Amino acid sequence: AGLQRTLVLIKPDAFERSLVAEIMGRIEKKNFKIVSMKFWSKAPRNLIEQHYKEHSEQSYFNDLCDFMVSGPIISIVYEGTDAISKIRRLQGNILTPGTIRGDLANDIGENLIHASDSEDSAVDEISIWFPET
Amino acid sequence: GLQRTLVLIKPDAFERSLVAEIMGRIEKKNFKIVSMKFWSKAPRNLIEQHYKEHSEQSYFNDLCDFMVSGPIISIVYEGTDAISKIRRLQGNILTPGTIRGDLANDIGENLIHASDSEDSAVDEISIWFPET
Amino acid sequence: GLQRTLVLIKPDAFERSLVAEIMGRIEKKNFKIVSMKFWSKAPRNLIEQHYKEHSEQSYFNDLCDFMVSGPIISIVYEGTDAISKIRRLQGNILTPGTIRGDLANDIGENLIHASDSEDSAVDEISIWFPET
Amino acid sequence: GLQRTLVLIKPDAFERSLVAEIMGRIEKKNFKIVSMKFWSKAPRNLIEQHYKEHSEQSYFNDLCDFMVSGPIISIVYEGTDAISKIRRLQGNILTPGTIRGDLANDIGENLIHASDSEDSAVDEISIWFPET
Amino acid sequence: AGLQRTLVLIKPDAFERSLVAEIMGRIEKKNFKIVSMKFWSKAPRNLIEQHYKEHSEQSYFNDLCDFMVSGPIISIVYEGTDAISKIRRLQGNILTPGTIRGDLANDIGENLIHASDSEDSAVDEISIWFPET
Amino acid sequence: GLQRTLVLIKPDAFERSLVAEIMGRIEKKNFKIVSMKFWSKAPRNLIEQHYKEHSEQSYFNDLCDFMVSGPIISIVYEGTDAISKIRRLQGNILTPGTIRGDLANDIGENLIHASDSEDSAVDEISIWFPET
Numbered sequence A, E: 001a002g003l004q005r006t007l008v009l010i011k012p013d014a015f016e017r018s019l020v021a022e023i024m025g026r027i028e029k030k031n032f033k034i035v036s037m038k039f040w041s042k043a044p045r046n047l048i049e050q051h052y053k054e055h056s057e058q059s060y061f062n063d064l065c066d067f068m069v070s071g072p073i074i075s076i077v078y079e080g081t082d083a084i085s086k087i088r089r090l091q092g093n094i095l096t097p098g099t100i101r102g103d104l105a106n107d108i109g110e111n112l113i114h115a116s117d118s119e120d121s122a123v124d125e126i127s128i129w130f131p132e133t
Numbered sequence B, C, D, F: 001g002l003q004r005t006l007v008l009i010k011p012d013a014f015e016r017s018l019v020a021e022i023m024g025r026i027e028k029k030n031f032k033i034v035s036m037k038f039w040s041k042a043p044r045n046l047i048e049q050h051y052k053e054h055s056e057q058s059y060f061n062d063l064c065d066f067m068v069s070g071p072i073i074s075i076v077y078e079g080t081d082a083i084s085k086i087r088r089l090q091g092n093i094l095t096p097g098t099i100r101g102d103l104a105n106d107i108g109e110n111l112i113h114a115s116d117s118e119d120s121a122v123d124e125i126s127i128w129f130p131e132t
């Protein structure tokens, strides 16, 4: 088809705010399927630093990593037609109502969800979170 | 600015149990059902008239088969600026906040039809609700 | 244990825009619409047959007027143990978790009717859906 | 950083029972109620103050009659970028995903007011919450 | 009719958990109307002690008052047919799914909502929260 | 005090897209995920262990074939009185307001498993989360 896989992280603010099912349900309602999933009570800093390696020289890098290890996270591989960009549009941004971030988040850092933004980041990010490839 | 527009609820909505969810978004925008029909299986002729504008397109035949692969509801909706507003509500599979935007992920299986103009609306209402 | 049961969506559901909300609770319990009619105003005769068991009660006449005071939907639902299950879903205005339980607050205006037995179900389905 | 902004829940929200729905959307985006008042009927001079930039418009008197036709809630909300984010949440009747986009369908009866700027905010908050 | 008024408090755990609209909406959907409402960023301890005067000799009294002043609360007079008992049944308990407490709360103390439990408590509680009678 | 309990989301939840709905209800009651695994297909000996008190029943093989017919999620949840409260949330197909009451309508395909006692809990958690 146009069948793809993408990588989603549920960030610690989602657990803190009890928005976990709310976020996953929006992705579920658009007809995407869980293909693999892991729950991390605390994620290894090395996994986070890899995941956000492209950001390693930004001002926010260290606080980002701190936050990403500050509570649980769930990593999920989703599957569906055009999954990468469709789930990316679902994530949206804090300025755009209708999307997960648009409806539920209000901060440039604590923003509930990561979604892969291209085939390249998807393959690489899936590799990081699910090395059992 | 009162208008009537024709909506179809497609078989995939029944398959996935999204019927109420879809009608609900239209209800909450304050549009009123003016008439409504349930079809366990729509007559093929009705579907062919409905998508006649499309009889030449490559997807036509698959499209008719899918429209007949399960139940559909035909609904006449009324309200201010209804045609254009229900069209926006329907949206597309790309932009969230809408019916397709939130619930659909296929170019074919996309849950809902809404008339896109005054002419199509009159025509489509007469196909499904010929007693006018 | 497959059964069919008759549901009415009452005018107050239209007044309060709870139509989709009500059909949704039944849809999510996995029952299937088998046939469905929308009435902008139900024929008084139909309402009188429907509530005939009640023609002697003091509330009868007010009840008929209310049933005719706006739109109703007549729905035939199918599924395992449908009659009894949709009855429980309907509930009463006292116990939350149900349709009336959650959404209604009147002994008269209570949003939904559901057949309460095998006999009433056959009878009511034949009143509203006589083409069987 | 943090801002505060003034929201009014308009009389159409009470009538259509959308009060919790509208407040809920603002609540789920993580804004906090700092101040809130319920007015079964808001005093007309308050409404006229609130809408004073509108005093020369043709809809001015009609808007004010509407705003006084049922209850309103005035709320001061606080959170990061509150003025602008709550404005976007309010949206408009052409923009699905927003409060007005999903729930409203009229130029005038559109459920919610939100301050549109730092200055209108500070002003509107002093109108409804002059204690401070 | 059978038209009554009752008094509802939204407790500080509701604000803390962002359940305020969720709780009010359940009461709204059952067709009850707000007749008066006040938001308290912090409620006067004397109001709480009065409100819970019948409990003044229970073990839990002091922690209850502490909690009731630990964050915002909203006091609301609701109106509707049989409002006192119907809104009481809506409140329910932490053991009963379908109700506010049944669905949303899990603690004998932090339980999101108070509703008046009789005509007597209603009149008295309304008096406490809305002396402007 | 705190307890932990084992929940399984059964294959019918995945098929009917109710996974987030079921988890959401447990989430809104303030229980926390301590451990969680997704099994695209659970190994049959795990399922047979899990249901070993059922090994002599007539439905045993059919239950296990079902449990293996699609994905399951196993979750350890934590909160006050978790075992018993989550059991009540699960409810049954006759009890509106619960997960099975609102969403399920079959004796066997009923969406969710929840440990029913301190002992079955500790046992079921060691079956699905033997690391500990």
Ligand SMILES: O=c1ccn([C@@H]2O[C@H](COP(=O)(O)OP(=O)(O)O)[C@@H](O)[C@H]2O)c(=O)[nH]1
Pocket: A055, A060, A063, A064, A108, A109, A110, A111, A113, A114, A115
């Ligand atoms: O100023 C910033 C920019 C981003 N981030 C975090 O780093 C992630 C990656 O940043 P990006 O701008 O690419 O956001 P995204 O791709 O996730 O939309 C974001 O999700 C934020 O959580 C941050 O903490 N501060």
Ligand SMILES: O=c1ccn([C@@H]2O[C@H](COP(=O)(O)OP(=O)(O)O)[C@@H](O)[C@H]2O)c(=O)[nH]1
Pocket: B059, B063, B107, B108, B109, B110, B112, B113, B114, B116
């Ligand atoms: O490549 C396509 C495009 C169209 N459709 C179907 O044909 C309908 C009408 O096509 P159109 O482009 O007008 O879609 P719409 O106006 O409904 O967005 C769509 O809703 C689809 O269900 C399809 O099956 N394949």
Ligand SMILES: O=c1ccn([C@@H]2O[C@H](COP(=O)(O)OP(=O)(O)O)[C@@H](O)[C@H]2O)c(=O)[nH]1
Pocket: C059, C063, C107, C108, C109, C110, C112, C113, C114, C116
């Ligand atoms: O005092 C009453 C009792 C009944 N009803 C109406 O009559 C219907 C049928 O009465 P019944 O007692 O059988 O109610 P149901 O079986 O639907 O719960 C109810 O749904 C109400 O709408 C009424 O108007 N007043």
Ligand SMILES: O=c1ccn([C@@H]2O[C@H](COP(=O)(O)OP(=O)(O)O)[C@@H](O)[C@H]2O)c(=O)[nH]1
Pocket: D059, D062, D063, D107, D108, D109, D110, D113, D114, D116
């Ligand atoms: O033709 C109009 C224009 C506006 N309004 C009302 O006046 C308010 C202020 O007008 P404005 O165009 O500034 O709307 P807003 O800024 O709230 O989007 C609107 O929200 C409407 O409720 C109206 O009743 N008729």
Ligand SMILES: O=c1ccn([C@@H]2O[C@H](COP(=O)(O)OP(=O)(O)O)[C@@H](O)[C@H]2O)c(=O)[nH]1
Pocket: E055, E060, E063, E064, E108, E109, E110, E111, E113, E114, E115
């Ligand atoms: O052991 C207890 C009993 C009750 N309460 C609090 O005191 C209120 C009144 O107690 P009651 O048993 O009457 O509960 P309610 O009437 O509110 O259902 C409750 O809502 C709880 O918040 C408490 O903190 N500990």
Ligand SMILES: O=c1ccn([C@@H]2O[C@H](COP(=O)(O)OP(=O)(O)O)[C@@H](O)[C@H]2O)c(=O)[nH]1
Pocket: F059, F062, F063, F107, F108, F109, F110, F113, F114, F116
């Ligand atoms: O006749 C039956 C009885 C039970 N079960 C399945 O076996 C599980 C365990 O049975 P039990 O009666 O203990 O159900 P539970 O304790 O989960 O409510 C149920 O949840 C069903 O999924 C079944 O398939 N057929």
Ligand SMILES: [Mg+2]
Pocket: A117
């Ligand atoms: Mg990025």
Ligand SMILES: [Mg+2]
Pocket: B116
């Ligand atoms: Mg078109």
Ligand SMILES: [Mg+2]
Pocket: C116
């Ligand atoms: Mg009866």
Ligand SMILES: [Mg+2]
Pocket: D116
């Ligand atoms: Mg403006």
Ligand SMILES: [Mg+2]
Pocket: E117
């Ligand atoms: Mg008590």
Ligand SMILES: [Mg+2]
Pocket: F116
């Ligand atoms: Mg058991």
